């Protein structure tokens, strides 16, 4: 996250850690036993930290639970970056409490100019490269579907949407992807792609979450 703020230990409870003997992407858990996250994250060998704040020191809070299963979305393309869209099973359930604890699936897409709160611990600089340890967070609001086409053409599915700031400086970033974007106290979005990082006319570009709860759940509940 570029130009964000630390979130605080604990403060975005449904945040994960993708670990394969290190951090690599985030992740949202939305039930006990799943997290949701980019289909560009997946690699075998997935270990899912949650309760995590300094993702190098061992705080009190966390839980590590190996992943069984993961499951990348039927259409997802990697040139594109279209539905790019994992979920991920636990091998056991995560204790649920105040510091751990699920964010809803939508029940129907946000809009343009709604602000939303993304966070990980990607980079935070936008030339150059420094790593947070600690969680970082960032308010941004959706952008219109015509200043995201226009920002990007030729890229911009009906699965994407657009949301941060024009003018630069304030993005998510490499190390982010796979996780949240929340607005409302639900899920619409997952941190996918963008045009380096916080780079003026180039804003983040997030998998759009409200289309995929029917296969979401429907995945769900038969495995
Ligand atoms: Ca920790």
Known sequence: ????????????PYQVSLNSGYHFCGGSLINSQWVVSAAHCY??????????????????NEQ?????KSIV??????????????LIKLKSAASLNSRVASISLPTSCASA??????????????????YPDV??????????????????????????????????????????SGGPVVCSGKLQGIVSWGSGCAQ????????????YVSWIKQTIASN
């Open 73 to 86: 979305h039927p259409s997802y393309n990697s040139n594109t970056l279209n539905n790019d869209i994992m």
């Open 135 to 176: 969680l970082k967070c960032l308010k941004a609001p959706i952008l219109s579907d015509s200043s995201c086409k226009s920002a990007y053409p030729g890229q911009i599915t009906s699965n994407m949407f657009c949301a941060g700031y024009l003018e630069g400086g304030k993005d998510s970033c490499q190390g982010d």
């Open 43 to 60: 690699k075998s060998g997935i270990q899912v930290r949650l309760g995590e704040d300094n993702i190098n020191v061992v705080e009190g």
């Open 1 to 12: 996250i570029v130009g964000g703020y630390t979130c605080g230990a604990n403060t975005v």
């Open 64 to 68: 590590f639970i190996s992943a069984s």
């Open 200 to 211: 003026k006319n180039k804003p983040g570009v997030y998998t759009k979450v409200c289309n």
């Open 113 to 130: 100019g709604t602000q939303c709160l993304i966070s990980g611990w990607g980079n935070t600089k936008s030339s150059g490269t420094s």
